[PDB]
């Protein structure tokens with residue numbers, strides 16, 4: 001049971017990483033994180049500030065350490 | 075390898091190559107002929123020179 | 134812990150997928166309530182909009198100023214996001230800490246009292262300021278010769294006393310784009326109103342403090358707009374609630390008289406060159422960590438260090454440490470401080486003869 005489950009879940013991890021890969025494609029926009037909030041206090045949600053002058057809010061961030069984002073972090 | 079491009083005032087995209095330029099032909103400070111759609115580094119260009127410094131060259 | 138940690142990795146990948154499904158939302162500012170389902174919201178891009186609100190957002194908490202989130206496609210209000218802190222303000226208040234305390238400052242004891250009567254007294258005893266009837270002071274323009282403690286005092290104030298400190302460089306406000314040299318000041322003063330008490334501290338203000346020109350260039354004209362924006366948010370058509378401003382410079386003469394008026398900049402604490410007994414405190418403070426190896430009677434150094442200004446004494450300590458190294462000795466000798474004092478005093482002639490007028 002454990003062997004088959006582990007062998008299948010390694011492949012499903014590879015599938016998840018591949019599904020991540022199909023959206024981590026260039027080009028990206030570059031934004032400076034304005035401030036990171038934990039909206040659950042009222043799950044980390046940041047407020048990026050794109051170089052296109054748009055201050056886009058995010059319901060939640062992903063693919064990036066939510067605790068390792070500081071103001072003025074490209 | 076990823077390249078950070080600083081379109082004058084439209085954006086500050088981060089972009090890969092465009093297969094028409096060797097990866098070692100691009101270095102910091104060079105001007106890149108970035109593709110319009112699905113931006114890419116296509117053609118490096120000579121460094122920007124001020125026009126007023128051009129006619130001061132006797133031909 | 135194979136299976137459990139693999140499940141944890143699965144939770145991480147699933148969170149990544151959920152983030153992949155999510156979408157962003159624009160941020161705007163509500164400026165009107167046309168109806169119960171029609172709002173006039175600004176956008177960070179700049180254009181205004183007539184936006185319909187959702188059904189779950191509490192319509193009561195929608196007045197001029199509240200930040201809201203806008204869906205990118207249909208431009209519909211989604212959330213009730215709280216007030217904003219500009220990143221160029223957190224980058225200011227998030228300075229390291231500073232390890233020096235009021236003990237580290239020597240000689241300066243009367244001016245410390247004068248500064249603390251405006252920084253600490255109003256913030257911790259607003260009752261004597263009532264029956265006596267004095268209007269609480271706002272500004273404290275520290276000024277003096279270059280290198281006497283005008284900045285170290287601010288570091289001590291940051292470490293000691295308390296209150297939300299905002300260290301402000303002079304040029305760290307000026308930006309290339311139009312108006313941003315004043316929006317930064319506006320957010321600086323707005324953050325204080327939501328973090329009372331605040332001890333906003335500019336520095337080297339003679340950059341944006343110059344006597345406003347009458348025929349200056351374009352650059353000197355946009356700065357004057359910043360000086361106006363700073364000037365109004367101290368005595369303008371509004372009262373600074375609980376904000377104290379500390380202000381430091383080396384050349385008070387090149388300061389705009391409108392900024393120098395008593396009423397905007399209150400008691401002008403002056404930090405002078407250390408004088409005799411003051412210099413002994415400086416020598417004791419700066420030559421206490423060093424491995425002293427003698428009866429360090431600094432009286433000769435006190436006599437010779439005439440006109441020395443603070444950090445210079447620390448430079449004599451540093452040069453004495455260097456001279457001890459020159460002989461490979463591992464601790465300074467009382468006759469090596471003398472050489473360093475002489476060497477620093479000779480260099481002091483290179484500096485211009487520091488002149489300044491008591492304002």
Ligand SMILES: Nc1ncnc2c1ncn2[C@@H]1O[C@H](COP(=O)(O)OP(=O)(O)OP(=O)(O)O)[C@@H](O)[C@H]1O
Pocket residue numbers: 237238239240241278279280281282283284285286337381382383415418442443444447
């Ligand atoms: N009273 C003092 N006791 C001990 N050290 C002092 C004293 N006053 C100044 N210093 C020294 O001064 C240094 C900090 O800079 P300083 O206070 O001289 O700058 P400043 O005069 O505020 O500068 P600016 O000319 O840029 O406004 C430190 O090395 C500190 O040891």
Ligand SMILES: [Mg+2]
Pocket residue numbers: 283284285
């Ligand atoms: Mg200073």
